[PDB]
Design an enzyme around this catalytic site. Structure first.
Site, PDB file in Angstrom:
ATOM      1  N   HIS A  41       0.849  -1.215   0.000  1.00 39.11           N
ATOM      2  CA  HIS A  41       0.000   0.000   0.000  1.00 39.11           C
ATOM      3  C   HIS A  41       0.879   1.257   0.000  1.00 39.11           C
ATOM      4  CE1 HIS A  41      -0.261  -0.281   4.623  1.00 39.11           C
ATOM      5  NE2 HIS A  41       0.327   0.890   4.349  1.00 39.11           N
ATOM      6  N   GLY A 143       2.232   6.467   9.346  1.00 33.61           N
ATOM      7  CA  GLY A 143       3.679   6.423   9.076  1.00 33.61           C
ATOM      8  C   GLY A 143       4.347   5.206   9.709  1.00 33.61           C
ATOM      9  N   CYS A 145       3.416   2.011   9.447  1.00 35.74           N
ATOM     10  CA  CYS A 145       3.292   0.855   8.528  1.00 35.74           C
ATOM     11  C   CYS A 145       4.692   0.458   8.042  1.00 35.74           C
ATOM     12  CB  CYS A 145       2.316   1.129   7.387  1.00 35.74           C
ATOM     13  SG  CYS A 145       0.617   0.779   7.918  1.00 35.74           S
TER      14      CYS A 145
HETATM   15  C1  LIG Z   1       0.197   2.228   8.915  1.00 30.25           C
HETATM   16  C2  LIG Z   1       0.217   3.423   8.003  1.00 30.25           C
HETATM   17  O1  LIG Z   1       1.253   4.062   7.882  1.00 30.25           O
HETATM   18  N1  LIG Z   1      -0.926   3.760   7.347  1.00 30.25           N
HETATM   19  C3  LIG Z   1      -1.050   5.065   6.695  1.00 30.25           C
HETATM   20  C4  LIG Z   1      -1.367   4.891   5.235  1.00 30.25           C
HETATM   21  C5  LIG Z   1      -1.068   5.925   4.347  1.00 30.25           C
HETATM   22  C6  LIG Z   1      -1.346   5.800   2.999  1.00 30.25           C
HETATM   23  C7  LIG Z   1      -1.923   4.641   2.519  1.00 30.25           C
HETATM   24  C8  LIG Z   1      -2.225   3.605   3.389  1.00 30.25           C
HETATM   25  C9  LIG Z   1      -1.961   3.717   4.761  1.00 30.25           C
HETATM   26  C10 LIG Z   1      -2.290   2.557   5.695  1.00 30.25           C
HETATM   27  C11 LIG Z   1      -3.665   1.963   5.466  1.00 30.25           C
HETATM   28  C12 LIG Z   1      -3.821   0.610   5.191  1.00 30.25           C
HETATM   29  C13 LIG Z   1      -5.078   0.069   4.979  1.00 30.25           C
HETATM   30  C14 LIG Z   1      -6.197   0.868   5.047  1.00 30.25           C
HETATM   31  C15 LIG Z   1      -6.063   2.208   5.321  1.00 30.25           C
HETATM   32  C16 LIG Z   1      -4.805   2.754   5.529  1.00 30.25           C
HETATM   33  C17 LIG Z   1      -2.119   2.930   7.165  1.00 30.25           C
END
Ligand SMILES: *CC(=O)N1Cc2ccccc2[C@H](c2ccccc2)C1
Ligand SMILES: *CC(=O)N1Cc2ccccc2[C@H](c2ccccc2)C1
EC number: 3.4.19.12
Lengths: 304, 304
Positions: A41, A143, A145
């Site tokens: 992602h 951030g 992730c």
């Molecule tokens: C954990 C993290 O950093 N996230 C922020 C993010 C930014 C942009 C795109 C995705 C995400 C992550 C996420 C994953 C699944 C659903 C919604 C968001 C979370």
């Protein structure tokens, strides 16, 4: 003496954390040998997260779109591939701080340390368990992730978790290092509810043994029970059923303390039926279930 | 979201841990620049610990009696001195992994991470507070002495604790890195009782703010109080008196949540008077007091 929620020392993993930027999304990557692992992602806008087609989104990305920074130094991306829900970025430089490692997929009830990172930089370390519902109760902001979960056996880091998402109930979902989610979760901004958060019975019993070993004994009683009788009580209190496998695993703590596993079960049964009556066990007012038998033996023996 | 008892990443400190052996006693040393810091009781037999005269015992020791091992490599000791309750071993090699550091003596209520080591090797990391009675509730076995407590500000490790002893009640006593004990404790195998373990009121309030920020709100009520009224309740429950200094420190969390500090005090007052009624706050069934306001802001903002 004293028993604490203890994480592995994080240095070996700190040495592996990098920043991955694709377009305007920045998260954490794990640099092992000449591969950087990160959540797929990274290629999404928050708009994309509603219903992403990762294979289609990925066609628009080249090696040079993945900006990989280890401290203040940029890594050259010479290849990229999607494996399940992770990207593997091939870089032209092997990480010189690569420790001995394995990727393991852990079972529910197993504990691990999380190195929470933002922009490839460590903020903190804490201890988790894979819940029976395949969530973890973490501490993860936007951030975070690509932050990873791990165990260490002397010199070998076993990577078991990469952080991917927060459910609307504020519990956490992620993948092993092959990019396969724990449980039924998907990397999509949709309706995903966690199942019953059952208590890890074998871990509570381990922690009761840890308490006895460290002087907390008020909950020892004159009773015993059977697996079947205990399990009627477990069912009622949303505890995992205790198996002979769990009894076998607790054998060493049983031996060390001279308290039969089924006697400790009878202690746990009275605690479930009667509560703590405002008392504490190893400074907790509830029954702790994120120490494994192996965790109790490790901490109580001083393994390094 | 999610709030966890979080330690600093330990790598910078892992790089500083060595083994110190004097005669038949082995414990941990901290190698910073060309100095190894360790507890002076390294020179004692367990026999000596009943009533040691460290200056007299030290006369029988030479540079070559202090065996200092960093991993599998021996360091050459070219000097030794006693400062309060620590020894400083001058070695012929500066530690190449020496991070930027300071020695700070912390106040009671301040939190720090402990890197528990045995034989100069890290076993784990966990978060502590200096208790109001100048004990810490640690996890320390024989061989853990010389393990250190620390805070990190971006790149600078502030070393605040070295582990020296366990009281018969299984709480912990130690020194700052100048070898001065926290509280009245002495490095002697004698009768030393801890005073009242009072609750760190400002840390409970910080943690209540952390709970609100992360969705746990059931304990918010319609009441307010005054410092003086709140403090009558604190006295009764062995809580530290709340000062305007503590109110000032909580200002940022107050601002972020829109809950006046004195309203949160009134919430804490009802929790003290009425208990949790079998409910939990950030997965705890008691009031947590080992997060500082600064800890809550750090974790809730993702500082690295
Ligand atoms: C954990 C993290 O950093 N996230 C922020 C993010 C930014 C942009 C795109 C995705 C995400 C992550 C996420 C994953 C699944 C659903 C919604 C968001 C979370
Ligand atoms: C923390 C530690 O490693 N200790 C073991 C030990 C071995 C030999 C001599 C002293 C000690 C430490 C100690 C300190 C004060 C009183 C008794 C024991 C503890």
């Amino acid at each position: 003496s004293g028993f604490r929620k203890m994480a592995f020392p994080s240095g070996k993993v700190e040495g592996c954390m990098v920043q991955v930027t694709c377009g305007t999304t920045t998260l954490n990557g794990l640099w092992l040998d000449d591969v950087v692992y990160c959540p797929r992602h990274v290629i999404c806008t928050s708009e994309d997260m509603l219903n992403p087609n990762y294979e289609d989104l990925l066609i628009r990305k080249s090696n040079h779109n993945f900006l990989v920074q280890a401290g203040n130094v940029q890594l050259r991306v010479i290849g990229h591939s999607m494996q399940n829900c992770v990207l593997k970025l091939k870089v032209d430089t092997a990480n010189p701080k690569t420790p001995k490692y394995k990727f393991v997929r852990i079972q529910p009830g197993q504990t691990f340390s999380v190195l929470a990172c933002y922009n490839g930089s460590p903020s903190g370390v804490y201890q988790c368990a894979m819940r029976p519902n395949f969530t973890i109760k973490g501490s993860f902001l936007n951030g975070s992730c690509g932050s990873v979960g791990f165990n260490i056996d002397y010199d070998c880091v076993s990577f078991c978790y990469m952080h991917h998402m927060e459910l609307p109930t504020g519990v956490h979902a992620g993948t092993d290092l092959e990019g396969n989610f724990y449980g039924p979760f998907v990397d999509r901004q949709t309706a995903q509810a966690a199942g019953t958060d059952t208590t890890i019975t074998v871990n509570v019993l381990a922690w009761l043994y840890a308490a006895v070993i460290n002087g907390d004994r008020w909950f020892l009683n004159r009773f015993t029970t059977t697996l079947n009788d205990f399990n009627l009580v477990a069912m009622k209190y949303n505890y995992e059923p205790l198996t002979q496998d769990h009894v076998d695993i607790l054998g060493p703590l049983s031996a060390q303390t001279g308290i039969a596993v089924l006697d400790m079960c009878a202690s746990l049964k009275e605690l479930l039926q009667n509560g703590m009556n405002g008392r504490t066990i190893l400074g907790s007012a509830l029954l702790e279930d994120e120490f494994t038998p192996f965790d109790v033996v490790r901490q109580c023996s001083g393994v390094t």
